[PDB]
Amino acid sequence: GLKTAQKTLFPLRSIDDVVRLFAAELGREEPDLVLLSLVLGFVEHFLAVNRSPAPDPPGGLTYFPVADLSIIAALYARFTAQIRGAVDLSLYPREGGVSSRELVKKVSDVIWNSLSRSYFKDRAHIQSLFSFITGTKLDSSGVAFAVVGACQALGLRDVHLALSEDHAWVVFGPNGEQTAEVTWHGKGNEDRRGQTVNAGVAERSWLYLKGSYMRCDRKMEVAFMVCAINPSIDLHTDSLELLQLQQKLLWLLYDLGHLERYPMALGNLADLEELEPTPGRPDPLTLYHKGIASAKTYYRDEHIYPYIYLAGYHCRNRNVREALQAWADTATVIQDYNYCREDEEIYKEFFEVANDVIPNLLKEAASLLEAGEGSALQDPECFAHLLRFYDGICKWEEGSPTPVLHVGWATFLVQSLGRFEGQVRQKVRITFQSEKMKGMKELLVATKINSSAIKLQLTAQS
Amino acid sequence: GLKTAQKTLFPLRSIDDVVRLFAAELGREEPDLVLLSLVLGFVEHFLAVNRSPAPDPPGGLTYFPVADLSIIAALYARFTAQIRGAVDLSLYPREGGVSSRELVKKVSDVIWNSLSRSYFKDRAHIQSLFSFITGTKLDSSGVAFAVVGACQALGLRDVHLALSEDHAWVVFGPNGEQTAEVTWHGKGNEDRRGQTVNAGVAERSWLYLKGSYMRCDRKMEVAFMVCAINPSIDLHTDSLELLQLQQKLLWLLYDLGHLERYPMALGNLADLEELEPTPGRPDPLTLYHKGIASAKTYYRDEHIYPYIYLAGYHCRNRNVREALQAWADTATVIQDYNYCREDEEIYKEFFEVANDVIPNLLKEAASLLEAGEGSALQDPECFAHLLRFYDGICKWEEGSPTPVLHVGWATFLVQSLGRFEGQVRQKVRITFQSEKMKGMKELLVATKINSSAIKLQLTAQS
Numbered sequence: 001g002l003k004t005a006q007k008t009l010f011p012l013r014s015i016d017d018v019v020r021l022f023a024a025e026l027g028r029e030e031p032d033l034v035l036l037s038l039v040l041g042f043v044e045h046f047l048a049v050n051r052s053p054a055p056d057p058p059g060g061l062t063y064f065p066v067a068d069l070s071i072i073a074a075l076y077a078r079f080t081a082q083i084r085g086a087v088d089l090s091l092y093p094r095e096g097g098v099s100s101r102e103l104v105k106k107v108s109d110v111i112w113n114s115l116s117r118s119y120f121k122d123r124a125h126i127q128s129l130f131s132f133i134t135g136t137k138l139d140s141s142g143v144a145f146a147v148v149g150a151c152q153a154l155g156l157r158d159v160h161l162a163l164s165e166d167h168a169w170v171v172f173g174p175n176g177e178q179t180a181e182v183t184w185h186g187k188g189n190e191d192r193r194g195q196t197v198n199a200g201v202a203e204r205s206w207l208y209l210k211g212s213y214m215r216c217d218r219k220m221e222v223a224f225m226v227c228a229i230n231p232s233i234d235l236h237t238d239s240l241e242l243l244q245l246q247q248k249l250l251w252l253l254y255d256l257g258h259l260e261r262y263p264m265a266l267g268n269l270a271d272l273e274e275l276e277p278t279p280g281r282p283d284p285l286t287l288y289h290k291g292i293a294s295a296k297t298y299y300r301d302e303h304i305y306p307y308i309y310l311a312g313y314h315c316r317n318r319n320v321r322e323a324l325q326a327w328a329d330t331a332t333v334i335q336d337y338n339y340c341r342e343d344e345e346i347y348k349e350f351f352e353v354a355n356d357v358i359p360n361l362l363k364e365a366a367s368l369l370e371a372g373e374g375s376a377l378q379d380p381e382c383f384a385h386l387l388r389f390y391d392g393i394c395k396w397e398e399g400s401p402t403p404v405l406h407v408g409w410a411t412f413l414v415q416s417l418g419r420f421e422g423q424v425r426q427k428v429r430i431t432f433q434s435e436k437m438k439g440m441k442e443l444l445v446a447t448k449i450n451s452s453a454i455k456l457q458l459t460a461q462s
Numbered sequence: 463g464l465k466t467a468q469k470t471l472f473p474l475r476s477i478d479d480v481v482r483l484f485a486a487e488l489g490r491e492e493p494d495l496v497l498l499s500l501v502l503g504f505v506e507h508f509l510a511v512n513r514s515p516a517p518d519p520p521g522g523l524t525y526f527p528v529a530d531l532s533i534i535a536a537l538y539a540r541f542t543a544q545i546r547g548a549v550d551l552s553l554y555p556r557e558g559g560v561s562s563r564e565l566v567k568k569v570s571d572v573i574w575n576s577l578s579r580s581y582f583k584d585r586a587h588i589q590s591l592f593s594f595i596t597g598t599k600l601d602s603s604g605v606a607f608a609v610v611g612a613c614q615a616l617g618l619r620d621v622h623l624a625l626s627e628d629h630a631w632v633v634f635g636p637n638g639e640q641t642a643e644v645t646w647h648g649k650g651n652e653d654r655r656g657q658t659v660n661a662g663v664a665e666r667s668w669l670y671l672k673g674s675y676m677r678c679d680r681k682m683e684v685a686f687m688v689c690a691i692n693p694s695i696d697l698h699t700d701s702l703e704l705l706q707l708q709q710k711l712l713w714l715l716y717d718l719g720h721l722e723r724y725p726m727a728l729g730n731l732a733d734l735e736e737l738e739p740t741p742g743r744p745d746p747l748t749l750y751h752k753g754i755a756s757a758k759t760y761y762r763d764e765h766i767y768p769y770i771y772l773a774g775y776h777c778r779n780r781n782v783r784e785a786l787q788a789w790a791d792t793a794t795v796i797q798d799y800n801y802c803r804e805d806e807e808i809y810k811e812f813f814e815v816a817n818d819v820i821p822n823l824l825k826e827a828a829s830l831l832e833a834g835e836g837s838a839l840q841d842p843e844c845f846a847h848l849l850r851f852y853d854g855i856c857k858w859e860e861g862s863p864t865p866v867l868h869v870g871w872a873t874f875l876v877q878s879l880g881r882f883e884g885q886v887r888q889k890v891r892i893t894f895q896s897e898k899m900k901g902m903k904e905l906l907v908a909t910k911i912n913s914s915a916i917k918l919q920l921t922a923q924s
């Protein structure tokens with residue numbers, strides 16, 4: 001049952017009306033996760049899922065799907081009735097505002113058992129409670145979010161969303177010290193629903209961030225649903241309206257302090273600001289730096305994406321030195337992880353940096369150097385950043401249950417090395433931490449680069 | 463030839479961006495009438511002229527046509543180049559910032575000779591310079607507005623819009639003391655273009671308001687184009703977007719003091735607030751009473767529509783006593799006019815009030831009274847307001863070159879009288895101003911209503 005103060009801000013007829021609803025909910029101690037997620041999913045459904053005067057507006061039309069109270073109230077009542085109907089709190093000895101693992105598992109099972117048996121896990125627009133209620137489809141992290149929403153609907157104030165950079169689960173109990181898996185991760189992995197994350201933290205996988213993962217409060221859970229907005233209409237086109245809505249909502253959260261402990265939300269906001277800068281706001285670079293400051297302050301500098309967001313920006317702006325330094329800093333965080341079997345998404349990022357982005361950046365630099373025959377390619381410190389990147393990757397691989405380096409990496413390493421003259425490479429000042437790079441130090445600086453020797457040494461398993 | 467400060471808040475992506483452009487222009491000594499009218503006309507053209515999840519948005523969509531600088535700048539340059547191209551200011555000596563009548567007539571003829579030869583004069587969405595430039599079509603008052611816009615584009619600071627409650631012309635020269643007709647009025651009337659309004663003022667027609675017409679400054683000309691917004695998509699549906707735009711622009715004008723001397727704009731704003739109240743704003747009644755205060759203060763209480771706006775609100779809200787008092791007040795203004803051959807629009811309003819609106823209001827009161835077998839029909843003051851309404855109509859007729867009353871008015875008078883019992887009618891002690899009502903004062907209050915005697919008196923000559 002929606003309170004009177006919630007009803008008076010319907011109907012929603014614009015992006016600013018949505019922003020106003022978020023503003024009002026975020027002024028409460030319990031922003032209503034179910035109401036806000038239903039609204040975002042409704043809007044995304046109709047802007048993305050179900051997508052002499054000029055004969056059509058010459059600058060295009062933008063659209064907004066009117067959200068009537070009668071529609072949103074009906075979806076809300078359906079969700080709350082399903083959860084309250086399925087969970088008898090009197091059956092769950094819950095001593096002093098701490099939920100039991102058995103109660104968290106019950107709520108989790110109610111969400112899980114409601115889902116359609118068959119759908120693609122990478123399907124777009126199945127993140128929201130709108131998708132849950134109207135299509136019985138949720139994506140992996142959508143299940144975790146829906147468990148937290150369901151727990152809020154039951155008054156279980158201790159159940160919160162936990163987030164790594166690629167996975168979601170719940171924290172509960174006194175001080176949020178208990179953990180439970182509530183959803184799947186990846187494809188064809190062992191079912192760990194119900195389990196703690198203690199094994200994941202101990203194994204030093206990126207997926208569990210060595211325990212430096214996000215423990216959300218209710219306001220951060222609102223920030224999560226805003227980052228979860230998916231503007232994609234199809235493979236090659238985005239809803240401008242959903243980008244603008246996400247941008248405005250992230251600025252609201254920013255102003256209220258709710259992105260302070262949310263590095264990826266700051267990087268998301270920086271990316272939107274690069275697309276369309278907001279008058280009077282910090283520039284993207286300031287926001288990427290705030291993301292890194294957040295990771296340093298709250299997460300022991302154990303996050304990878306803050307550095308990837310920054311390096312990406314420098315790449316797009318042809319800041320060759322700064323991009324290489326940021327990719328070096330990325331590798332310096334990953335080297336203190338072990339590459340585990342559910343870490344593939346961050347492997348994909350390092351693969352793309354090593355084998356595509358760095359080669360294209362150094363190629364652009366080679367073209368600049370040619371035109372008017374000081375370049376990053378003539379700078380030993382820039383070469384040192386390239387080597388520090390590879391050193392971090394090699395150190396990440398050490399002690400890991402899955403290999404990282406393959407002969408394909410060696411091809412790109414040889415191409416990247418060859419962008420720097422022998423006399424520049426021979427001036428490099430570096431101490432390596434990885435056995436592989438220590439072993440390869442003569443090959444990396446040789447005037448004539450030996451591709452066969454670099455391939456053998458980079459890909460050794462020994 | 464747009465200034466840099468104007469370009470920076472394109473593109474316009476929302477209703478609030480349009481409001482921000484109006485706010486910026488209204489902070490200048492010469493708000494740019496051509497830019498503002500082009501923007502409103504562009505937005506109106508694309509929002510009204512050219513316009514388990516539900517399969518279609520269940521509350522519909524709202525739209526906004528993005529207004530790019532390149533589109534609006536192109537239309538602006540077309541207008542300014544056409545006017546500056548066609549009018550050689552070197553041929554019209556102009557000491558002391560007073561335009562000559564021949565200069566005003568030239569600019570008027572340039573607008574007039576640009577128009578399409580054949581189009582419906584009451585066509586919707588041909589009020590703006592957008593319509594003029596892209597369709598060579600303007601409605602009656604649109605021509606007057608475009609003459610003023612063209613004079614501003616030529617730097618003629620003394621040329622202003624004049625409007626009555628049913629007509630527009632221009633005022634110019636020292637103190638706006640010169641007048642020129644620049645457009646047509648009504649259908650099948652003799653053309654007065656190039657003439658002063660002196661004959662209209664002297665005849666005491668409603669059309670020229672006995673000289674108590676609006677003499678706009680540039681800020682009031684902005685208020686005019688905002689009132690001119692036409693949200694109608696077709697006979698039975700309005701653009702919510704254009705209603706919201708008009709409402710927000712009228713509140714901007716209100717806050718800046720620009721509706722102080724604009725009774726009809728205050729009535730328009732009251733009507734919009736009744737449809738969709740703005741949190742924290744005065745209620746409709748406060749606004750209707752501000753409109754009447756404006757008419758009393760600045761226009762000698764010689765305007766009709768302020769009272770019609772109030773009467774209309776009370777009618778819609780079934781406030782029978784207050785509606786009749788407001789119609790009585792409307793008749794008390796008209797009685798000091800002469801009914802002239804181009805006053806048809808206000809004749810239609812009085813005819814409809816006498817022969818439809820008051821009959822329906824008294825019938826509804828009679829139904830309420832029947833169901834409780836106190837009523838407005840038991841209130842002598844309600845009867846006195848009905849008599850004052852007819853008394854003002856009869857006094858309006860006196861000395862008029864067009865008769866007002868005829869046998870078509872008699873049956874409704876007799877029926878309205880008969881809604882009040884003899885004992886109620888016999889409590890009033892009033893002295894009539896009209897010869898016609900004086901000549902049946904006993905008949906109006908007699909226990910038995912003599913319908914044929916009242917008809918003979920109401921239809922008597924003069």
Ligand SMILES: CCN(C(=O)c1cc(F)ccc1Oc1cncnc1N1CC2(CCN(C[C@H]3CC[C@H](NS(=O)(=O)CC)CC3)CC2)C1)C(C)C
Pocket residue numbers: 127140141163164165166167168224227228229264265268305308309311312313315316349352353357
């Ligand atoms: C994006 C969807 N999403 C998650 O993937 C997610 C799910 C979880 F359970 C836990 C974490 C999750 O990630 C995020 C959570 N909160 C906010 N943002 C999240 N994102 C943004 C994310 C990382 C960055 N990338 C964009 C990068 C990709 C690499 C790119 N560098 S480059 O290779 O192009 C160099 C030029 C820069 C932009 C998008 C996806 C993951 C959430 C928001 C539902």
Ligand SMILES: CCN(C(=O)c1cc(F)ccc1Oc1cncnc1N1CC2(CCN(C[C@H]3CC[C@H](NS(=O)(=O)CC)CC3)CC2)C1)C(C)C
Pocket residue numbers: 589602603625626627628629630686689690691726727730767770771773774775777778
């Ligand atoms: C509205 C269009 N318009 C004019 O008609 C106009 C043109 C002129 F040359 C000179 C005056 C003009 O009138 C206005 C000027 N400025 C603002 N508003 C003008 N209006 C509003 C206007 C009078 C009132 N009526 C509305 C009444 C009609 C009766 C109604 N009674 S009811 O409630 O029982 C039925 C809903 C109450 C509201 C609409 C048209 C004329 C201008 C703005 C271009």
